[PDB]
Amino acid sequence: PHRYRPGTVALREIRRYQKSTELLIRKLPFQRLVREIAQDFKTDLRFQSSAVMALQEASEAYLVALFEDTNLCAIHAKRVTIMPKDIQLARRIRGER
Amino acid sequence: PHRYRPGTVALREIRRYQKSTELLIRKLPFQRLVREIAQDFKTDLRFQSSAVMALQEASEAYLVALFEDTNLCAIHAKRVTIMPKDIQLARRIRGER
Amino acid sequence: KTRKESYAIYVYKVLKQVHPDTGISSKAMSIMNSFVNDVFERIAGEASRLAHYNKRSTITSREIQTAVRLLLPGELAKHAVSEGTKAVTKYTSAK
Amino acid sequence: KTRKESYAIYVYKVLKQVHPDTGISSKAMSIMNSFVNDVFERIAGEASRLAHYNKRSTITSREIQTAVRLLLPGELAKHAVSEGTKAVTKYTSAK
Amino acid sequence: AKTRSSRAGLQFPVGRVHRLLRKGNYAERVGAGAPVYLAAVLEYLTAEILELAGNAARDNKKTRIIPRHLQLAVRNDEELNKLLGRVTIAQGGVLPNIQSVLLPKK
Amino acid sequence: AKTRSSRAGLQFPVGRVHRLLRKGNYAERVGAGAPVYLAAVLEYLTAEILELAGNAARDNKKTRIIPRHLQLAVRNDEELNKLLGRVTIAQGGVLPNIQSVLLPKK
Amino acid sequence: VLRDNIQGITKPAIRRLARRGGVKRISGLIYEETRGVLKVFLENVIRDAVTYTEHAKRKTVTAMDVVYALKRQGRTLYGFGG
Amino acid sequence: KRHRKVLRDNIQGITKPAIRRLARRGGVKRISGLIYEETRGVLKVFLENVIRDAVTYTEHAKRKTVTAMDVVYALKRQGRTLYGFGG
DNA sequence: ATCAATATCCACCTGCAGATACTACCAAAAGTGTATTTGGAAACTGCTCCATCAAAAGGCATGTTCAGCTGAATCAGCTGAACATGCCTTTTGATGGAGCAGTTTCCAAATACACTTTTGGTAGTATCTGCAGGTGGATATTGAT
DNA sequence: ATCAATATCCACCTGCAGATACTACCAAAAGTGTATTTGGAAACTGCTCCATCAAAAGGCATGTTCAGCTGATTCAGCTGAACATGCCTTTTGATGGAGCAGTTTCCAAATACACTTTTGGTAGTATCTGCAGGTGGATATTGAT
Ligand SMILES: [Mn+2]
Ligand SMILES: [Mn+2]
Ligand SMILES: [Mn+2]
Ligand SMILES: [Mn+2]
Ligand SMILES: [Mn+2]
Ligand SMILES: [Mn+2]
Ligand SMILES: [Mn+2]
Ligand SMILES: [Mn+2]
Ligand SMILES: [Mn+2]
Ligand SMILES: [Mn+2]
Ligand SMILES: [Mn+2]
Ligand SMILES: [Mn+2]
Ligand SMILES: [Mn+2]
Ligand SMILES: [Mn+2]
Ligand SMILES: [Mn+2]
């Protein structure tokens, strides 16, 4: 019976996803959300396939960079665990709040 | 002989400066700094005095807003004392890095 | 002895309408003048781009309106849009 | 049908000058084209403002040059300026 | 001869705005409605800020609007604040604000 | 006839750049040298990125530049990174980077 | 088995994003915080793209609409035109 | 012209109390001893960046005098738009 | 809680900097009226490329376990706030003179056509190949003891 | 330490999705040439306001003291990482049709263009006023006890 310690697979994952460039959110659920949010602005919209892709690329680049700032915020408080207050601090300082 | 406790005068100064709008750096020293820096880019420059005042309003608003972000980074660390690591964090998150 | 336009007098007219007994310092007026030019440049710019994106050589009240919706937050956009429509509608019948 | 211009062919040429054995994927070429568009707009943009600030009707290579110094970081600015100056000379001194 | 301003019922100079759009190099052509709509947005916006700033002035027992009043007016208003989110009002200072944890006792 | 690109010594199209400046509403007038100058600047920067992106391709055992290599080229170069500091390269991913304090205690 | 669209942005997916952002350990509360942040991000962008769609009198949101929306939010994207 | 004094170490003209005052306006209650050098360093970067672009506008116009407008445009370029000086 | 130091809050109070008021001018707006050109809206339609859905694929919801991380509690040490004290540096108001900026004159350079040759983009077509995945096997890394 | 499980590295293989070479064509750059307008450098100098300075006005530098903050130490309990797999959501790819985009057309409104009137800016000269900064003197706030 075999067991890797907590954080061991995490590091393995960091290295894996930092090596690659594929999108990390499944496309369909992302698309539905996009259309839902769009429905509040105008009804009966269609979307170029590439348009959703653009939004996904943009949204994933944004969240990945936010997690970097979030992680610096956590580490600044001498933790290794990211918490909502880390996200909050990052966004407040980025000028998004 | 009477003594205010540490913190008390400092809170009094916060209210005092938050209430007013005058520039907080003495004019001449600031003006020399501007001329020193400019001269190192280009010799034999003159300055409209309103040019120097514009740079001073801009720098003072920049520093006050940075100190606010810095305060937030310290408090996030559960301190009340701002430190170089706090400013460095704020500047990193802001994209000045 | 070259002429330098500002929006000062128009800012002053509007001030009298909304606060008939209140004055404005020359520095506050300078800031008001900077704010009007600033917003002007920001709307005209959006309008400029928007036209370029659509292969239009003409900036119309319609480009101005989209620019206003891109540029102003929520409730200011709503009101700016009514104020602008209303002036153009009124303008159209008045010659 | 309608004509869609791109910097692709000219980007391909420069690639062959710089890595004659190296190719480029579509998506990469598409990014490079955006890059060229983006930088053009940024430089032309700044050149436009410079001309306006100085009450001039013309965007000359002097405005392009200053725009370049305003937008590009040090070492990148330096080479761009010389590459630009060099090309305006070669163009002048040739029938 | 009625000004194009009065035709649209505006204080702001429609003539001026039309001209500035041309000199401004924004497009080949300016539509006749454009300076009208723009001048009214401009007037609206300046009414909004003068209203608010006027109130700050009164709240302070002052008769004259100074840069401090414009700053209070802008920063106390969610939408103006965001619209001027990247703007500095000289001689405006900041909003009184002190973080909880900095206060004495408990 | 000899093209202005060839006269200038450039791959990048001086004619197009010239036309694009006129039709882009940047000023009433465009000097004859300006499109030469700008085309050169654009070519230069294209060469600098391609240089570095080609290298990153070589390092990764490949002959075809993909977006990954463009990203690596840009974010490993201090200056290119600053110019593109607010740009997202689709399909670029990130630089391999782990904060030291997260590294397993040896 | 009905489910909110936003919840379609799953924990493992958010975990992956954090991972690429170099995050080692994640609190349970982060997943909801992220979905909220994505929602605000998408609202701001789509609102602007849609506005570009309406201006052009189309019923389809184009890549360019989105590209232009991103450019004006100061989040320039390369790879889809422009 | 005959002689003109040498400008050096003017950064120290940004004194401890001046910095402390700025930190008060920004809501700061307690200041570590090393903040003062850090702040000077940060300010100098800020000034170098704005002065460089301002001076660039100056030279472009062919003046020897840096105008309020030179500064106001440098600020606008860097996304730190300033109202109150003609800009 | 009560006593005493010192900051704070007003209210009124004269100087005055900056704001407001006219009377004159005027160049450049802004308007007006006709002559002349065209941007783009309107309406028709072809064919991408988008929403939909069936069959095929393969990621995630799931509950349990416990490692190791977070936050609470305690506390020595020392850094930073407060304040006293001694006096240097900045602020302020006044003045020759640099350089900005105001007007005018003039041509090298730009815009505008027109007419002539070319090229970049497209589209049909066929032809080619770098490299993502697959495999298989050695070798390294992690965790158990 | 040895050891076994399982991840990771690399060398080689190959099908195919996306790169590429080659032809034919055309509208629209792109260029060359000729007739014409003008933007702005130049050459001069009015005159605003910048560097400079002397005297006046007030903030800064410094050292001593200790209050209380930070950072170190330990610890217990809470909370998120790891775990394996079949249900069920997403992916794939096939197919009608919606709408973007290509083309033609035609006039409401664009620019230009010349005399006609108006008006916003400034400049010269004058009186008026909101409030800054001084004052004393009643009302908190703070910190020792
Ligand atoms: Mn020097
Ligand atoms: Mn119309
Ligand atoms: Mn080479
Ligand atoms: Mn037409
Ligand atoms: Mn406990
Ligand atoms: Mn200790
Ligand atoms: Mn002189
Ligand atoms: Mn060809
Ligand atoms: Mn492989
Ligand atoms: Mn002229
Ligand atoms: Mn002493
Ligand atoms: Mn335990
Ligand atoms: Mn149809
Ligand atoms: Mn008048
Ligand atoms: Mn007072």
The domain total for chain G is 1
Provide the resolution (angstroms): 2.5
Give all domains of chain E, ordered by start, each with its CATH number: 1-106 (1.10.20.10)
Whether CB of A47 is under 7 Å from strand J: the answer is no
Strands B46-47 and H65-66: parallel
H77 vs D62, D63, D70: nearest CB: D70
Q: Are strands G25-26 and G76-78 parallel, antiparallel or unpaired?
A: unpaired
Integer distance in angstroms from CA F56 to C1' I120? 31
- Smallest CA-to-CA distance from B35 within A67, E58, H8, F46 is with H8
Exposed, middle or buried by CB within 10 Å (0-12, 13-18, 19+), for D21? Answer: exposed
Residue with the two structure tokens 């996030």: B76
Which amino acid makes up residue F42? L
Characterize B24-57 residue by residue with b for buried, 16 or more Cβ atoms within 10 angstroms of its Cβ, and e for exposed.
bbeeebbbbbbbbbbeeeeeebebbebbbbbbbb
Q: Are G63 and A58 contacting, i.e. CB atoms less than 8 angstroms apart?
A: no
CA D80 to C1' I114 (Å) is: 37
**Beta-ladder partners of G76:** F87
The distance (Å) linking the CA of G23 with the C1' of J35 is 71
Helix (H, G, I), strand (E, B) or coil at C50: helix
Phi and psi dihedrals of H79, rounded to 5?
Answer: 75, 30
Collect all residues of chain D within an 8 Å Cβ-Cβ radius of residue G76.
Answer: 38
Across-strand partners of E30? C59
Cα gap E81→E100, rounded to integer Å:
23
Fold of the domain built from segment(s) D1-95? Histone, subunit A (1.10.20)
Phi and psi for E88 in degrees, rounded to 5? -115, 125
Q: Do chains H and A touch (3 or more CB pairs under 8 A)?
A: no
Which residue in A83, E105, A48, E104 sits closest to H29, CA to CA? Answer: E104
Calculate the alpha carbon distances from D29 to C70, F67, F92, G33 in Å.
30, 8, 13, 37
The spacing between the Cα labelled CA in B11 and the C1' in I81, in angstroms, equals 12
| Pairing, β E64-65 against β C58-59 | unpaired
Token digits of residue F88: 């997202």
Question: Do chains D and B touch by CB distance (3+ pairs < 8 Å)?
Answer: no
Furthest C-alpha separation in chain G: 47
Copy the structure tokens of residue G19.
């991972």
Q: Which among H25, H83, H85 is the nearest to E87, CB-wise?
A: H83
CATH code of the domain covering residue H45: 1.10.20.10
Q: How far apart are CA C44 and CA C50, in angstroms?
A: 10
Within 8 A of B47 by CB-CB distance, chain H residues are 65-66
G65 vs C54: CA distance, rounded Å: 11
Complete domains list, chain A, with CATH: 1-97 (1.10.20.10)
Q: E strand or H helix at D82, and its extent?
A: helix D74-92
Contact residues, chain F, for E28 at CB < 8 Å = 25
Angstrom distance (rounded) from CA H50 to CA H73: 9
Q: Which of residues 38-77 of D touch F (CB under 8 A)?
A: 38-40, 43-45, 47-48, 51-52, 56-61, 63-65, 68, 71-76
Indicate the DSSP class of residue F9. T
3-state helix, strand, coil in chain B (%, to 5): 65, 5, 30
Smallest Cα–Cα separation from E13: which of E35, E32, E30?
E35
In chain D, where the domains are located = 1-95
CB atoms within 10 A of CB F64: 11
Angle (CA) A60 A65 A66, round 5°: 95
**Minimal CA separation from E103 to chain F, in Å:** 33
Give the Å distances, CA to CA, from H6 to A62, B26, B32, B39, H74: 49, 20, 11, 10, 27
Beta strand residue intervals within chain G, DSSP E: 25-26, 60-61, 76-78
d(CA B2, CA A19): 65
CA dist B33 and H11 (Å) reads 6
Q: Say which residues have a Cβ less than 8 Å from residue H75's Cβ, sequence separation at least 6.
A: B54, B58, E88, H50, H81, H82, H87
- DSSP code string of chain C: ------SHHHHHHHHHHH-TT-EE-HHHHHHHHHHHHHHHHHHHHHHHHHHHHTT-SEE-HHHHHHHHHHHS-HHHHHHHHHHHHHHHHHHHH--
Look-up: residue for tokens 């992302």?
A: A30
- Secondary structure letter of residue H79 according to DSSP: T
Distance CA H3, CA A69 (A): 52
- B16 contacts chain A (CB < 8 A): no
Tell how far the Cα of B21 is from the centroid of ligand 1, in angstroms.
32
Q: How close D89 gets to chain G, by Cα (Å)? A: 31
Name the residue type at position G7.
Answer: Q
The answer to whether strand J lies under 7 Å from the CB of residue C5 is yes
Largest CA-CA distance found in chain E, in angstroms, rounded: 72
Rounded to whole angstroms, the Cα distance separating D76 from F44 reads 9
